Specification:
This protein has one domain: Single Sheet (Ubiquitin Ligase Nedd4, Chain: W), CATH 2.20.70.10. With 37 residues, the protein is an all-beta fold. The chain starts with 11 loop residues before the first strand and ends in a 6-residue tail after the last strand. Strand 2 and strand 3 form a beta hairpin. Helix content is 0%, strand content 30%. The chain is globular and about 25 Å long.
Amino acid sequence: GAMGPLPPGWEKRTDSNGRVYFVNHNTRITQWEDPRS
């Protein structure tokens, strides 16, 4: 695993319920699709 770190701005975050999402700091967008694919 560990296909690299998140692209400048992204991060692998967890929500209140237990899902893993990807947060973009730049746009402040909460996306669910994995950028490190």
